Design an enzyme around this catalytic site. Structure first.
Site, short mmCIF file in Angstrom:
data_model
loop_
_atom_site.label_atom_id
_atom_site.label_comp_id
_atom_site.label_asym_id
_atom_site.label_seq_id
_atom_site.Cartn_x
_atom_site.Cartn_y
_atom_site.Cartn_z
N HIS A 148 3.70 11.07 6.42
CA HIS A 148 3.09 10.81 7.72
C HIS A 148 4.06 10.20 8.67
CE1 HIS A 148 -1.14 10.65 5.69
NE2 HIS A 148 -0.72 11.88 5.92
N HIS B 155 2.14 9.11 1.05
CA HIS B 155 1.12 8.88 0.04
C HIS B 155 1.46 9.81 -1.13
CE1 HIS B 155 -1.49 6.96 3.17
NE2 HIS B 155 -0.76 7.78 3.92
N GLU C 99 -3.21 13.51 0.97
CA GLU C 99 -4.50 13.09 1.51
C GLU C 99 -5.23 14.29 2.07
OE1 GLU C 99 -3.52 9.59 4.00
OE2 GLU C 99 -4.45 8.64 2.25
N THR D 137 -5.98 6.85 7.92
CA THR D 137 -6.53 7.07 6.58
C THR D 137 -6.53 5.80 5.72
OG1 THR D 137 -4.40 7.66 5.57
CG2 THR D 137 -5.68 9.48 6.62
N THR D 138 -6.10 4.68 6.30
CA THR D 138 -6.18 3.37 5.67
C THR D 138 -6.95 2.46 6.60
OG1 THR D 138 -4.11 2.57 6.66
CG2 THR D 138 -3.98 3.60 4.49
N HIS E 275 0.83 -1.22 0.00
CA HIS E 275 0.00 0.00 0.00
C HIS E 275 0.85 1.25 0.00
CE1 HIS E 275 -3.29 -2.66 1.05
NE2 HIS E 275 -2.61 -3.06 2.11
N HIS F 277 5.76 7.07 6.52
CA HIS F 277 5.43 6.63 5.18
C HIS F 277 4.91 7.81 4.40
CE1 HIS F 277 1.65 6.35 7.46
NE2 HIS F 277 1.08 6.73 6.33
#
Ligand SMILES: NS(=O)(=O)c1nnc(N(Cc2cn(-c3ccccc3)nn2)Cc2cn([C@@H]3O[C@H](CO)[C@@H](O)[C@H](O)[C@H]3O)nn2)s1
Ligand SMILES: [Zn+2]
Length: 258
Positions: free
Chosen positions: A117, A94, A104, A196-197, A62, A92
């Site tokens: 993040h 996004h 995000e 958020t996941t 992911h 991590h």
């Protein structure tokens, strides 16, 4: 669970396995800079990363996580809206398929190329798994990335990505200094939200920095060469691994600055 960011398993589908996806404090959100309220009562943020011990970098299918030794108070976040001590466990990103998308959180509906993040957990709860079951269990420090000049502090991350191309691959990643990923200013917005996941747990105090960092086109291009798939499977580029903004509902975003 087989969630992801495609048409058939992406964010619009998550609520079926994780009903909290339609909950009251979901993340990310749009930060309306003209509605966010300066809270003169927020303390300065304390980012204490001098003793940070990075261990490993992992492609989890992911995103990729850079993992830290969080068995002691080495790298911690304090102050701001936070009560107590939050231990860094991983960071991590996004990011998008194109430079105009990937973050995000959004700012006045503006999307950034990516979002970093830094995930921390409240030590009062003893371990991460306990912390995520609490409304104040996590603090995630969110940093926007825009494309411009290269970020020297990011390059060691960029250079190891070839060795974790596919899902499940990991590599040693010791002696990385996360301080090299911070902008000059620690001015931030803060609000109560969620992972958020999946499993989208409502356990996060979000701290989103107002100042983005700049990364080069070549740097983010290397993010986009990662794979969602595992080795020996058809290639699916790891891009657009971001959840879109969610309803703010009954929440106020507070600003540390005017
Ligand atoms: N987009 S964001 O809002 O910021 C994030 N979205 N997900 C994040 N993490 C992954 C995660 C784990 N769990 C979870 C659920 C139930 C029980 C326990 C954990 N929910 N989301 C944060 C995260 C967790 N971990 C795991 O923590 C454990 C303690 O060390 C251990 O299993 C591993 O080391 C590591 O896999 N790593 N990252 S953050
Ligand atoms: Zn994240």
């Amino acid at each position: 669970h087989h969630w992801g960011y495609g048409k058939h398993n992406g964010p619009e589908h998550w609520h079926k396995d994780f009903p909290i996806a339609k909950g009251e404090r979901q993340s990310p959100v749009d930060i309306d800079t003209h509605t966010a309220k300066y809270d003169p009562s927020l303390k300065p943020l304390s980012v204490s990363y001098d003793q940070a011990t990075s261990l490993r970098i992992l492609n989890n299918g992911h995103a990729f996580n850079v993992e830290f030794d969080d068995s002691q108070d080495k790298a911690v976040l304090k102050g701001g809206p936070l009560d107590g001590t939050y231990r860094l466990i991983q960071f991590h990103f996004h990011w998008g398929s194109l430079d105009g998308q990937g973050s995000e959180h959004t700012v006045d509906k503006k999307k950034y190329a990516a979002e970093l993040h830094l995930v921390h957990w409240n030590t009062k709860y003893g371990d991460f798994g306990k912390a995520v079951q609490q409304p104040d269990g996590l603090a995630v420090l969110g940093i926007f990335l825009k494309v411009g000049s290269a970020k020297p502090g990011l390059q060691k991350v960029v250079d190891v990505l070839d060795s974790i191309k596919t899902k499940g691959k990991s590599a040693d990643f010791t002696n990385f200094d996360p301080r090299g990923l911070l902008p000059e200013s620690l001015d931030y917005w803060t609000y109560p939200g969620s992972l958020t996941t999946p499993p989208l747990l409502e356990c996060v105090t979000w701290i989103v920095l107002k100042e983005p960092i700049s990364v080069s086109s070549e740097q983010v291009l290397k993010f986009r060469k990662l794979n969602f798939n595992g080795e020996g499977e058809p290639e699916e580029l790891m891009v657009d691994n971001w959840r879109p903004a969610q309803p703010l509902k009954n929440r106020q975003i507070k600003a540390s600055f005017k």
